[PDB]
């Protein structure tokens, strides 16, 4: 009667920490014969320890081997604690154990091979521990075993062939382990299996055909393994199957057409299974299928119209395949269809008007296809439309002017089509637009003032159209992050309100007609990493305020009329990789502060009025690699000696100056691939190391009479 209680005390000696109640109620009192009122304990009719339940206490220690002394133990619940150490093989001695839950601990080493002795054991939870080693075959010989959860351990080796011995096993979870080898054919003999989680392991070989012997199967996950061979699955069994996920394996063959047999299937997911061949017609037999994801395979052929018979279809993900043909009009028929993801395929023809008429579709992701046709006015009638990415297709015609009225557009990316006409004023009517991508079309006209109103726009890409006119003013509390307008006809001054968008990261205004001065307000943009104003009619000077943009990687103002001296305050853009001033009126001599930017790998200041000489400071620039272009500055002097320090410099254009000097210093550029010295007054011979390119590009030395030969 005291025996179990004494057993509990030895076990207690193995514990690092216990709740205060354990400290206070577990102890020998000459007036107490039994542990039955002790904190974690529940006793028998006969007053022996029936249950020991420590769950979700903070208990640290080991489970001592004395646990085997409790021959009346029914429930042992240690779940969710700090336990560590090995699981004792003497547990195989608790002859009455029904439930054994060791989950969510730090248990380590091997799973005991003695659990076989437990004739009454129903549920076994080992999940979320540090367990390791092989799985004992005896583990599937536990006679009454119903549920077994091994997930999240370091377990390794094969799924034991004895798995076929477990005729009571209902739910078996092995995921997130090191299990390797072939799935044993004997798995089909485990006849009760409902839920089978084999995913996230190291398994190889084929899905065994005997998986078709399990007629009580609901849930099968074999994904994230290394499996090959055909997927031989589907049969008159699998009428109970709700969920199938085979994703991330390398199969040889296609989607098995036999899946037509599994009438209850809710979700069919094989993403990246190296599947080739055709999408089977038989998939149209599935009335309950809410998810079909075949994406990232080698799938060919057309989409069967029969899929328009999957009445419950919610997600159809076909993306990243070789699929061809027209999108079946039958799909518009599905009134539960939320997301149609066709992108990155070979689809052609128009999107059938049925699909454009869907009041269920939120997301139409068709980009990177050969699709074409005109955008119908019906599109403006899809009330649930949120994301539409039609980019990289043959779509033509105007964008319907009402797009955005029956509101709630979030993302419009139409880039890279043949679209003509103006930009619709209503795209932001619902005040949800994050992404307006119209770039690379035939569009024209100005930017509607209403679009300027949309503060939710994060990414605005109009680049490469026939757009023209002035820019909108932008607001404080505008979300603009990425702006690219390059290659248009935009004119007028750069709006100063652009500096108010605190989250602005990237600005490309290049190849436009912008005039006037660069607004000093742009000094407010401290998240700006990239700025391209190049190729405009910009004039005046660079505001020193731009020194406040501390995040700048890339700054290109080239090809404008800018003048003045380069502000020395710019010594603080400590992230600058790229500086391009070429083709302007800049003066005040070549900037000295350049070495302060340790990150500068590209310096092209060509064709300005800088004057003076090449500074010796130019010689300590740590990272100069891609180009150094000083050409066309009326630079006078000789090549300063420090310049020979640039041993990472790949290209040098010094040409078209008044430099009168040796050319000797160039022996020191050890990485130089290309050089251009022309129309200079350099006296004396050519250095040795410029030969190979001197052989191929002799032109680069012209305008220097006094250059000699070796």
């Amino acid at each position: 009667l005291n025996s179990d209680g004494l057993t509990l005390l030895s076990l207690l000696k193995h514990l690092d920490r216990v709740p205060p109640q354990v400290t206070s109620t577990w102890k020998i009192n000459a007036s107490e014969a039994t542990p039955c009122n002790w904190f974690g304990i529940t006793c028998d009719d006969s007053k022996n320890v029936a249950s020991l339940n420590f769950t979700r206490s903070r208990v640290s220690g080991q489970l001592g081997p004395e646990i085997g002394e409790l021959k009346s133990l029914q429930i042992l619940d240690l779940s969710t604690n700090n336990f560590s150490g090995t699981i004792p093989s003497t547990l195989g001695n608790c002859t009455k154990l029904a439930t054994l839950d060791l989950s969510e601990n730090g248990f380590s080493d091997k799973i005991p091979d003695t659990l076989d002795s437990l004739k009454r054991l129903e549920v076994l939870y080992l999940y979320i521990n540090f367990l390791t080693g092989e799985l004992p075959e005896s583990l599937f010989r536990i006679p009454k075993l119903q549920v077994l959860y091994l997930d999240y351990n370091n377990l390794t080796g094969p799924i034991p062939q004895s798995i076929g011995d477990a005729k009571e096993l209902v739910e078996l979870s092995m995921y997130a382990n090191q299990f390797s080898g072939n799935i044993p054919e004997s798995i089909g003999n485990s006849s009760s299996l409902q839920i089978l989680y084999l995913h996230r392991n190291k398994l190889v070989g084929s899905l065994p055909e005997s998986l078709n012997l399990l007629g009580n199967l609901t849930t099968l996950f074999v994904g994230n393994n290394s499996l090959q061979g055909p997927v031989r699955f589907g049969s008159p069994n699998c009428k109970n199957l709700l969920t199938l996920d085979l994703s991330y394996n390398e199969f040889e063959g296609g989607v098995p057409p036999a899946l037509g047999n599994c009438s209850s299937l809710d979700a069919l997911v094989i993403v990246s299974g190296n599947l080739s061949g055709t999408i089977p017609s038989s998939l149209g037999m599935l009335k309950n299928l809410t998810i079909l994801n075949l994406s990232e395979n080698r799938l060919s052929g057309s989409i069967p119209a029969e899929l328009g018979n999957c009445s419950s279809l919610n997600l159809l993900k076909l993306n990243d395949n070789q699929l061809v043909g027209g999108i079946p009009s039958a799909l518009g028929k599905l009134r539960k269809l939320e997301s149609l993801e066709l992108f990155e395929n070979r689809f052609s023809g128009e999107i059938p008007i049925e699909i454009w008429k869907s009041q269920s579709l939120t997301q139409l992701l068709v980009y990177q296809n050969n699709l074409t046709g005109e955008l119908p006015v019906e599109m403006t009638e899809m009330k649930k439309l949120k994301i539409a990415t039609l980019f990289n297709n043959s779509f033509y015609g105007a964008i319907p002017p009402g797009l955005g009225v029956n509101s709630s557009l979030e993302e419009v990316d139409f880039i890279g089509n043949k679209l003509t006409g103006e930009i619709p004023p209503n795209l932001c009517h619902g005040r949800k637009l994050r992404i307006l991508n119209l770039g690379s079309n035939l569009l024209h006209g100005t930017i509607p003032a209403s679009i300027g109103h949309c503060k939710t726009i994060r990414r605005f890409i109009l680049r490469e159209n026939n757009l023209s006119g002035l820019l909108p003013e932008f607001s404080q509390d505008h979300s603009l992050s990425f702006l690219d307008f390059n290659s248009n006809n935009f004119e007028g001054p750069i709006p100063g309100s652009l500096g108010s968008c605190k989250n602005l990261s990237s600005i490309n205004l290049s190849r436009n007609r912008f005039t006037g001065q660069i607004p000093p307000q742009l000094g407010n943009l401290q998240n700006l990493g990239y700025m391209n104003l190049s190729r405009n009619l910009l004039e005046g000077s660079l505001p020193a305020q731009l020194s406040n943009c501390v995040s700048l990687e890339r700054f290109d103002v080239g090809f404008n009329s800018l003048n003045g001296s380069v502000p020395s305050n710019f010594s603080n853009w400590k992230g600058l990789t790229t500086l391009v001033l070429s083709e302007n009126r800049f003066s005040g001599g070549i900037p000295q502060f350049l070495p302060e930017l340790k990150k500068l790998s590209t310096l092209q200041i060509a064709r300005n009025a800088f004057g003076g000489e090449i500074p010796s400071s130019i010689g300590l620039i740590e990272d100069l690699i891609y180009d150094l272009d000083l050409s066309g500055n009326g630079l006078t002097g000789e090549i300063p000696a420090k310049l020979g320090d640039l041993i990472k410099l790949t290209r040098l254009n010094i040409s078209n100056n008044n430099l009168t000097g040796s050319l000797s210093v160039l022996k020191g550029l050890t990485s130089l691939l290309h050089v251009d010295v022309s129309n200079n007054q350099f006296t004396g011979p050519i250095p040795d190391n410029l030969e190979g390119q001197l052989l191929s590009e002799p032109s680069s030395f012209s305008g220097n009479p006094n250059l000699c030969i070796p």
Binding site: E171, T219, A267, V271, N319, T389
Partner: peptide, 17 residues
Amino acid sequence: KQRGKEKVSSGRPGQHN
């Protein structure tokens, strides 16, 4: 038996420019 159902693979979300 005990816990919540394991979720099926999402695949890759659609991108934009």
